[PDB]
Symmetry: C2
Subunit: 253 residues, 2 copies
């Protein structure tokens, strides 16, 4: 698939961002809009492409038929706290390979879109990653998984410690893996990494991060594995490795 | 002092944000705008209030005469990386006590202003902190100091570890202490904490964080000390303590 679905996704992404931007208007039970958004998006594509499959929130089991990997609201915590960093992400795959991705920054109203072989764009502007190969001039982004047990957050702190020790020019934790991947998608950041993020968070962000220079691999260096809750994206393969090589396998799924 | 200076600060903050928003337009030597901004701001107030003193970037030595504590650009790193989170902060003090504060989010165009006894406002909207007393429902913000030696970033990771362990509902690192303090200033965040941040970073943010419920104290619980590169702000005295009590003295100045 191509064009028709891509346009449908954009329009849904936008309509969605609106309902969630609006939902943010006033004063933990607003996990209803999440549904409403996912409900809006899916009930419509499921009615326009009846043969398609849908992946959202074991479950993630990607087939060869065109499937939509959707994250109605990335950053619920931000949302529940009205911290203006939340998104809607719609990625589309066919033949078990990511075709396009659409990500809307609801409050800032930034629409990141990337179609394979067609490049990446954020509100009309064509995104290009940075060329940053030196991990000492890198601006690394990350997210603290959903866990909290002393064991998992032992390698978390240490892993961040390694990057910091690595003389890392700076690390940011914005609470929205998708939007963080979108910063890397543009000049904004030089690399992202994490464990515990699901397939619907990197589905769309990867088509973009790729269509704009960038590289998305496994926390091992190996090829990207949607099923494994782990990823490492960066401006260049150089950086993509120094980060991965310096990481330490934690365990999510 | 009061009114006249406050208006002058707003206008300078705005004009400043513009030059820096504009400076962000295109493709590490743009540490000139920093000067230009600080130069603009100071050369004008120093010409409108000749008897005033100015504090900016030992140095911080606050007197009883009206002095301006200025941070021309908070978040140079973000700036150097075009990560859309950078600010201009202008705080004003008289009688060794903070009178008002003005903070401009250059890209988002958000103008946080707070005058003691007159409350806090962000673009006309009146800010109020959250009521969050439970550290398990808190959204904590922080910043990694400018250091990197293994010792200082031993308590950093551990201190964050303690909050996380404390079952902290979430932690964010946006690279802009002022703007983070402004999120806490509004509903956005429930608490902030850090070591290694200078007096010009919390000068203005404190008048605001206070004029909106909020509390700003020392990482010890004691009263706020501008001179010490350390602060702990929060929605309520409850939270303000759990955070402080669980911290571990690091050392900056």
């Amino acid at each position: 698939p191509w064009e028709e679905c891509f346009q449908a996704a954009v329009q849904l992404a936008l309509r969605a961002g609106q309902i969630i931007r609006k939902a943010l208007t006033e004063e933990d039970l607003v996990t209803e809009t999440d549904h409403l958004v996912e409900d809006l998006i899916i009930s419509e594509l499921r009615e326009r492409f009846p043969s398609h499959r849908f992946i959202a929130e074991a479950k993630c089991v990607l087939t060869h038929s065109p499937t939509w990997i959707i994250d109605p609201i990335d950053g619920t915590c931000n949302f529940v706290h009205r911290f203006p960093t939340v998104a809607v992400s719609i990625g589309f795959a066919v033949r078990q390979e990511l075709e396009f991705g659409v990500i809307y920054h609801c409050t800032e109203e930034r629409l990141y879109t990337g179609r394979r072989g067609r490049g990446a764009f954020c509100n009309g502007q064509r995104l290009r990653v940075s060329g940053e190969t030196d991990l000492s001039k890198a601006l690394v982004l990350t997210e603290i998984g959903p866990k909290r047990d002393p064991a998992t957050l032992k390698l978390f702190l240490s892993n961040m410690e390694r990057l910091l020790h690595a003389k890392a020019h700076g690390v940011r934790v914005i609470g929205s893996s998708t939007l963080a991947l979108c910063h890397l998608a543009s000049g904004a950041a030089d690399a992202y990494y994490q464990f515990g993020l699901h397939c619907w968070d990197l589905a769309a962000a990867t088509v973009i991060i790729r269509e704009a220079g960038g590289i998305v691999i496994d926390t091992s260096g190996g090829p990207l594995d949607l099923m494994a809750c782990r990823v490492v994206a960066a401006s260049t393969r150089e950086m993509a490795m120094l980060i991965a090589q310096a990481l330490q396998t934690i365990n999510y799924g």
